[PDB]
């Protein structure tokens, strides 16, 4: 039966994630990707009535950490986007660490625990790229970057959103699976080639 | 399709101006970043950079070269100039008109280049 | 300025072959270097551009890598059209430096 497996399944859509994240050197994006998918996976599992019996802690805290969790995978994602020089580069990730932290535990199902990371993490990105093209007088980002990477990421990214925030209210079982997979190869997509503050 | 082509004197004696042109077609110099550029090849040496002359009528010039340098527009006469004030014979060389993009930020059109020498 | 070195100042090799020129910076230049290729009485052709990309029209044979500080361009089933002088353009900054060339020849 579909309806308890498929969310739970399509929750390790994040292992190919946490896999290349690991082998460029993003090793902190690979922790919260892995945290991520662990809690993702465990709050789909607790919530299927056939296997509800598996979860080991109470379902309020892999609710909250399931969507704690989520919001942090795509700050840590734009934010290596970002690739931001030190000591900018840490205070950018406890920036969002902590105010994802204080507004999910205020209102996990609140307006502003997606958008809110996702639309400060644009435009941090937006006023980078944009002083940087005044300084190169040309495209930051080469061409192939745009084509090959932020176009595709984010394609893959507002899919997953219009899946999850539109679509979901049609079908459950396969859209938010589907939600899954276009998250995963979002982040994939939105993390660079390789850690140049690590190799 | 895009062409530079450069003029100058052939022939100068040291300490006075060499007046480069630079004349172009198959773009405009005042189209949004669009730049035009000069580099030289000094005589049995390998490429020096000189000059960049840009969109938003923003100038650069090479440290080592910056205090007798100056680079002039034209866009009526789709041209750019280059001034080299006091020569010295270090100064002969090939100089090249090279025209830089936005998407692109090196230069991907040259001109043949002029032969510049200068002695007494 | 950043400092380019070409690595061979001159290389002779078969027609048919193959040829790899290596380059370092004094300091990185972010991938944003690109070759060009210098014929007696005519003007540098672009090649490759942001390390890796090939101009559109540029013969396949032509390919770029590198990241950080040390890059190389290397040419395969070398023609005789490819005896030229290829330069390497820093262009991290707007002050531009080449690399000192590489004269290819036949042998």
């Known amino acids: 039966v579909a309806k308890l497996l498929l969310p739970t399944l399509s929750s390790l859509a994040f292992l190919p994630t946490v896999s290349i994240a690991t082998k460029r050197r993003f090793y902190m994006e690979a922790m919260v990707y892995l945290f991520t998918m662990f809690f993702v996976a465990f709050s789909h599992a607790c919530d299927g009535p056939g296997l509800s019996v598996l979860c080991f802690m109470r379902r309020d805290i892999l609710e909250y950490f399931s969507i704690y969790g989520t919001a942090l995978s795509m700050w840590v994602s734009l934010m290596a986007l970002a690739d931001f020089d030190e000591p900018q580069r840490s205070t950018f990730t406890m920036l969002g660490v902590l105010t994802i932290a204080v507004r999910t535990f205020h209102d996990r199902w609140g307006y502003g625990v997606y958008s809110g990371p996702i639309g400060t993490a644009t435009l941090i990105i937006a006023v980078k790229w944009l002083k940087k093209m005044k300084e190169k007088k040309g495209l930051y980002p080469d061409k192939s970057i745009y084509t090959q990477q932020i176009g595709p990421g984010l394609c893959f990214g507002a899919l997953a959103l219009m899946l999850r925030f539109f679509f979901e209210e049609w079908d459950y079982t396969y859209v938010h699976s589907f939600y899954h997979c276009a998250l995963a190869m979002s982040f994939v997509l939105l993390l660079p080639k390789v850690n140049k503050k690590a190799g | 399709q895009v062409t530079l082509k450069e003029s100058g004197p052939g022939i100068l004696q040291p300490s006075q101006t060499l007046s480069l042109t630079c004349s172009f077609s198959?773009?405009?110099?005042?189209?949004?970043?669009?730049?035009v550029s000069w580099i030289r090849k000094p005589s049995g040496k390998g490429l020096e950079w000189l000059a960049h002359?840009?969109?938003?009528?923003?100038?650069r010039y090479n440290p080592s070269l910056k205090s007798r340098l100056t680079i002039s527009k034209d866009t009526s006469s789709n041209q750019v100039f280059l001034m080299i004030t006091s020569i010295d014979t270090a100064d002969t060389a090939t100089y090249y008109c090279?025209?830089?993009?936005?998407?692109?930020?090196?230069?991907?059109?040259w001109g043949q280049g002029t032969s510049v020498t200068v002695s007494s | 300025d950043i400092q380019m070195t070409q690595s061979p100042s001159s290389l002779s090799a078969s027609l048919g072959g193959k040829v790899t020129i290596t380059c370092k910076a004094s300091?990185?230049?972010?991938?944003?270097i690109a070759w060009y290729q210098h014929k007696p009485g005519k003007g540098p052709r672009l090649l490759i551009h942001?390390?890796?990309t090939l101009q559109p029209g540029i013969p396949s044979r032509f390919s770029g890598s590198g990241s950080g500080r040390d890059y190389s361009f290397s040419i395969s089933n070398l023609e005789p059209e490819d005896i030229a002088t290829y330069y390497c353009?820093?262009?991290?900054?707007?002050?531009?430096?080449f690399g000192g060339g590489t004269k290819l020849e036949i042998k």
């Open positions: 090279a025209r830089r993009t936005w998407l692109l930020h090196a230069m991907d059109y």
């Open positions: 198959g773009f405009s110099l005042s189209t949004s970043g669009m730049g």
């Open positions: 002359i840009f969109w938003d009528d923003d100038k």
């Open positions: 300091q990185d230049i972010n991938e944003y």
């Open positions: 942001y390390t890796s």
């Open positions: 353009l820093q262009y991290d900054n707007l002050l531009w430096t």
